[PDB]
Amino acid sequence: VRPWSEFRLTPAEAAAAAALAARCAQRYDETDGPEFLLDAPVIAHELPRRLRTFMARARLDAWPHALVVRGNPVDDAALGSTPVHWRTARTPGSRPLSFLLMLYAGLLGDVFGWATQQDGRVVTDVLPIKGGEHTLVSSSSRQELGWHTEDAFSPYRADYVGLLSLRNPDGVATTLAGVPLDDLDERTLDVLFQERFLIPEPVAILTGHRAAPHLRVDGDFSAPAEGDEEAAAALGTLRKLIDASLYELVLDQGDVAFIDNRRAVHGRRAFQPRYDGRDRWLKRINITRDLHRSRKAWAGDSRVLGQR
Ligand SMILES: NC(=[NH2+])NCCC[C@@H](N)C(=O)O
Ligand SMILES: O=C(O)CCC(=O)C(=O)O
Ligand SMILES: [Fe+2]
C-alpha cells in the first residue's frame, strides 16, 4: 500500500488539462490577478471528469497524507532554464503550468499567499538559490529541509500545500510523515493536546479527534513552554517517532502533490545543487478550505495575508 492517494492521467486527459491551462494563460494576464483568482475554481469544472471525481472523493477519505496527480507533460525546451532566484521565476515557459496548478488547486479550496513571502505571490517558487544552500527555507539544497507543518506559527496556515514539479532530473525526494498514532502512548498524547508548546502564546501540537488528530509542529522551530519538562518530553518523543516514520515521495517532472497540512508534516531531502540551468524546480500554492477563517489577516480586498 501507500500512505497517499494517487491518480495517473491518461495522455488524453493530461492533454485536455494542459490545453485548458493554455487557454487561461491566453485570456488572463497573471495567475494572481483578482480576475483569475475568482474565475479559476469555476474554470476548473471544465477539467477531465475522472480527475474531478478523484479530487472530490479523495479529499473526503480519512487516511491519505496527500493527493498525488501523475502524468502532466512538461517540455524542457519550452520550459527554459531554471531561474536563479524566485523574483525572476515567472518565466513564459512556466506560465501555463502555473495556471494548471491553480486550476487543480481550485478543486480543493481557496488559494492564498502571504505578504511576507515571495512578495505576496499566490503561485510561489521552490528552487535552489546559490549561497543559500544551508538555510531553513525551501530554496535550500545541501542541507535537508527538515519536516514541518507549513506556517505552523499561524492559525491562518493552509489546509493543503500544492507542489507541481516542473523538473526534478535527479529524483530528489519530498519527505512526509503523519501523526505516529501507532506508537504514541496516551499520556504523551494527552500532553500534546494541551496548550504547552511554542511555535508567542502557548499552543497545542495535536487537536481534534484522538483517534485521528490534526498536527501543528515544526521540527526546527517547535519548543516546549518555558520550564515545562513534561511538554518537553512529549515533544522529544514526537520528534523521534516522526524521524523514524518519515518516508519519501519523489515528484517527477509533471507530478502534482497536494499535501494535507493537518494530517502530515513534510520536508525535502538534502541534494547537491547543479546551478547549470536544469536544477530541480517546483511551483507551489497554499490552499484553505475556508478563506474566511483568516479574515483578520486580510490586507484589504486581496488574497494576501498580513497580521501584526
Ligand atoms: N525549515 C523548517 N523546519 N521550517 C520552515 C520552512 C519554511 C518553508 N515552508 C519555506 O521556505 O517556505
Ligand atoms: O522541495 C520540496 O519538495 C518541499 C518544499 C517545501 O517544503 C515548501 O516549499 O514548503
Ligand atoms: Fe513546506
Curated annotation (Swiss-Prot):
Name the keywords, alphabetized.
Answer: Antibiotic biosynthesis, Iron, Membrane, Metal-binding, Oxidoreductase, Transmembrane, Transmembrane helix
- The EC category is oxidoreductase
Q: What is its EC number?
A: 1.14.11.41
User: Mind telling me which residue stretches traverse the membrane in this protein?
Assistant: 97-115
Q: For L-arginine, which residues are the binding ones?
A: 136-138, 218-220, 284
Topological relation to the membrane, as annotated: Single-pass membrane protein
Task: Give the protein's biological function.
Answer: Involved in the biosynthesis of capreomycidine, an unusual amino acid used by non-ribosomal peptide synthases (NRPS) to make the tuberactinomycin class of peptide antibiotics such as viomycin and capreomycin. Catalyzes the stereospecific hydroxylation of the C3 of (2S)-arginine to generate (3S)-hydroxy-(2S)-arginine. Usually clavaminic acid synthase-like oxygenases catalyze the formation of threo diastereomers, however VioC produces the erythro diastereomer of beta-carbon-hydroxylated L-arginine.
Pfam families this protein is in?
TauD
Please state where this protein is localized.
Membrane
Q: Which family does it belong to?
A: Belongs to the clavaminate synthase family.
One GO location term (cellular component): membrane
Which coenzymes or cofactors are required?
Fe cation
The family database entries (Gene3D superfamilies) matched by this protein are listed as:
Clavaminate synthase-like
The name on file for this protein is: Alpha-ketoglutarate-dependent L-arginine hydroxylase
Listed pathway(s): Antibiotic biosynthesis
Highest taxon of source: Bacteria
Swiss-Prot/TrEMBL catalytic activity: L-arginine + 2-oxoglutarate + O2 = (2S,3S)-hydroxyarginine + succinate + CO2
- Where is 2-oxoglutarate annotated to bind? 174, 280, 284
Q: Which GO terms describe its molecular function?
A: 2-oxoglutarate, L-arginine oxygenase (succinate-forming) activity; 2-oxoglutarate-dependent dioxygenase activity; iron ion binding
UniProt: Fe cation binding residues:
148, 150, 266
Q: Name one GO biological process term.
A: antibiotic biosynthetic process
